[PDB]
Curated annotation (Swiss-Prot):
It comes from Homo sapiens (Human). RBM10 transcripts also code for an alternative open reading frame (alt-ORF) coding for the MINAS-60 (AC P0DW28) protein. MINAS-60 and RBM10 ORFs are overlapping and are formed by shifting the reading frame. It is found in: Nucleus. This is RNA-binding protein 10. Binds to ssRNA containing the consensus sequence 5'-AGGUAA-3'. May be involved in post-transcriptional processing, most probably in mRNA splicing. Binds to RNA homopolymers, with a preference for poly(G) and poly(U) and little for poly(A). May bind to specific miRNA hairpins. The lineage of its organism: Eukaryota, Metazoa, Chordata, Craniata, Vertebrata. Residues 2-82 form the RRM domain. It comes from the Eukaryota. It is linked to TARP syndrome: A disorder characterized by the Robin sequence (micrognathia, glossoptosis and cleft palate), talipes equinovarus and cardiac defects. Associates with the spliceosome. Component of a large chromatin remodeling complex, at least composed of MYSM1, PCAF, RBM10 and KIF11/TRIP5. The gene is RBM10.
Length: 91
């Protein structure tokens, strides 16, 4: 899988906090879904982070033993899908 659902985030965390954590492991995020949007609803105490490479999700997962820590909150990580297999990317 290349998606990393980050459950148990705080309200206060940002898209940019996560950019920091990804880059500390030396992993690009392809995309980040954490607050900001309003519309789709990314502002709940989770993220839906996606990687360019299926291995890279597993990289960030296992290199943190399947738990991160952002603004002190203990965050869990879960594959919410294998990959986005929609035929559209603007729907």
């Amino acid at each position: 899988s290349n998606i990393v659902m980050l459950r148990m985030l705080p309200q206060a965390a940002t898209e940019d906090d996560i950019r920091g954590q990804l880059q500390s492991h030396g992993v690009q995020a392809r995309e980040v879904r954490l607050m900001r949007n309003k519309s789709s609803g990314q502002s709940r105490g989770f993220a839906f982070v996606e990687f360019s490479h299926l291995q890279d999700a597993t990289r960030w997962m296992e290199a943190n033993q399947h738990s991160l820590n952002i603004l002190g909150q203990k965050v869990s990580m879960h594959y919410s899908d294998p990959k986005p297999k929609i035929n559209e990317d603007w729907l």
